[PDB]
Design a protein around this ligand. Sequence first.
Ligand SMILES: Cc1cc(NC(=O)c2cn(C3(C)CC3)c3ncnc(N)c23)n[nH]1
Ligand SMILES: Cc1cc(NC(=O)c2cn(C3(C)CC3)c3ncnc(N)c23)n[nH]1
Lengths: 274, 287
Amino acid sequence: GPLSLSVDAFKIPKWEFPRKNLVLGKTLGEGEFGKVVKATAFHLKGRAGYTTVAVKMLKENASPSELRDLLSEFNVLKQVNHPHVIKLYGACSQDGPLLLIVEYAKYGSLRGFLRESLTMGDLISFAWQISQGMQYLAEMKLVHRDLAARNILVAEGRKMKISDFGLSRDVQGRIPVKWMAIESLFDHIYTTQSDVWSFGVLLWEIVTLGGNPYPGIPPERLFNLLKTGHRMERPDNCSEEMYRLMLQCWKQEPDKRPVFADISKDLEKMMVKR
Amino acid sequence: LEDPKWEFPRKNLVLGKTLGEGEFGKVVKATAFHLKGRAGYTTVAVKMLKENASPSELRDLLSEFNVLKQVNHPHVIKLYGACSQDGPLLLIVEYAKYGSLRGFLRESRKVGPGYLGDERALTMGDLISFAWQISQGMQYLAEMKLVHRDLAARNILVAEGRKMKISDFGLSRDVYEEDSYVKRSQGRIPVKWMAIESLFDHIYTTQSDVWSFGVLLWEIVTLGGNPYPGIPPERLFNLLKTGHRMERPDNCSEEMYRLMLQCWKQEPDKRPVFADISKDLEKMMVK
Ligand SMILES: Cc1cc(NC(=O)c2cn(C3(C)CC3)c3ncnc(N)c23)n[nH]1
Ligand SMILES: Cc1cc(NC(=O)c2cn(C3(C)CC3)c3ncnc(N)c23)n[nH]1
């Protein structure tokens, strides 16, 4: 089938990293996304000595869907280069488990980083960096699908990195209900404008310092609440202008939502006006 | 839609500790007041959506509910009811005091009297009985034109009297129309339990459940061993296609291993059906 074709083609120069030059270290995180470990990589992409990296691999008892997702991430990440998209350095396809080698983010996920915590200027900068990355991916005709604070990484210099491309598509449902657009929930449609909806939820997560969206509402009740026009209220320590941006990301009609260039512009205007 | 045969008052269900959490959802221990004619409280288990559930997880829980309303067997987990209205979907089922079969067998390695070659003492006779009970459950599910798809030791429960209960119907599908279920997209069943034709061709039948049953037999006789130990799942495509199968484990007769190998035949029509698996396990017990 499609996966067996992909695996064999993958197994068989620019991307293949010698397994002997990778020393896997401590586990950074585990879950349905897979397993990510810290590692050191000798002579990685022409760099002297050891480069500290993160390595993504399959969890125990991986399904075809999880293997397909990891191969899809490699395919996507080969083609993208942006300061706020996680950088692929290579893969190990010839020695034991499939490994993807990416840049290391020392502060972990944005959700984790915010929860352990920053000024409102920093939070607006974090939103802007992510919007810049998303504007780039939108221009490359990639729909990410899984935008959330857990899938943004915080690297050296508090630099945002979009990660977790396993659900991404070129332009059943495994995106959590609470980050999904209304058209995604009811009609199974995913576009850059549904990424904008998810970005709105991510913006709410940023201002709440890694809060849980729609707290107390189960996802099985959220379907009807979104159709009737209910949205999350303005949270504590959030300006009227920032909340206005969120609400526009959650417009029922996708054409009424901002594009990422509009989101980036809003955040640029905010930061100069401070 | 609310079915008064199954709908249970929310105020009558009290939830306790998490028994298990993962891809399947979340299962908690609970108690239910005035459940299905029983006066007072009854200890039960409740399956619910985990935190940050997706539409696929909700559809799977709804599908389990629909399946378990229609299927009844001494070796299938018993549905008692559901709380479906004005809140999270909670499925109320029979509590299995010993947990998963995988967990129960792994405990038998360290908990006396252990495996010997009362209910913590295990013999090969007991292991054959467990396999037989599961095969009886699967034979009935096959008559019901249901393919389970996710048969594994982690998804068999060990209840009072060490009675086997098939659980985790979230991936199960009806095959009444063509005797097969086919999915265009990639499945969510762990690779190491999948039939060759499921892995390559996305075809699921009762004969692909038979393959999975063979892997379950291997898990039973190894006291909860991990299939294809140390082999990455991406290597299974080549491994299976070239005719490789798991070797005869320690603690496995020739007859039992022949049954596993029969369950892993490349051609699905050469594999035994569940009625014959049941017969094979009966002949092993009596001798
Ligand atoms: C190919 C790919 C890799 C990836 N994800 C990460 O690289 C990372 C995930 N984490 C978490 C928060 C789980 C531990 C990381 N932590 C520190 N550095 C990191 N590069 C990561 N997505 N797609
Ligand atoms: C509708 C449904 C329920 C279910 N699963 C379980 O009810 C159970 C799962 N576990 C595990 C091993 C995870 C903790 C149980 N343990 C003790 N009793 C139990 N009834 C269970 N599948 N489908």
